[PDB]
Amino acid sequence: DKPIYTLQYGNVGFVVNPKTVNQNARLLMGYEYFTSRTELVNAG
Amino acid sequence: MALINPQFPYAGPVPIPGPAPTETMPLLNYRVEGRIAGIQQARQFMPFLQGPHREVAEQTYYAIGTGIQMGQTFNQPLINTQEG
């Protein structure tokens, strides 16, 4: 309903506070987003 | 009459390698003078006749005469003496 959209890098983040961390632990993120083309399609 | 794709347009043709430009140009082929050879005969011994033919045959005639006409010895009738 309201997409995350900043203008400066890292101006919104995703936070996890873990309670127990084992060895070789990692956090696999997956994003879906809209990116834009500069120079719009210009009707031809 | 193609429709222009506005999302993926393309430009005009770019230069490509070419086919050695003189090898697409021909020579203009140079005719010498010629002659229908020999002295022609005036007539030919044709295998068919050159005139008309007739579909049907018509009977022809020629006149003949008869001969010297002679006299005759007739059998002569009887005299009409009121019996006839």
UniProtKB/TrEMBL annotation, chain A:
It is found in: Virion. The chain holds residues 347 to 390 of 395 of the full protein. This is Major capsid protein. It comes from Enterobacteria phage PR772.
From TrEMBL, chain B:
It comes from the Viruses. Pfam families: Tecti-min-caps (PF09300). GO terms for cellular component: viral capsid. This is Minor capsid protein. It comes from Enterobacteria phage PR772. The gene is XXX.
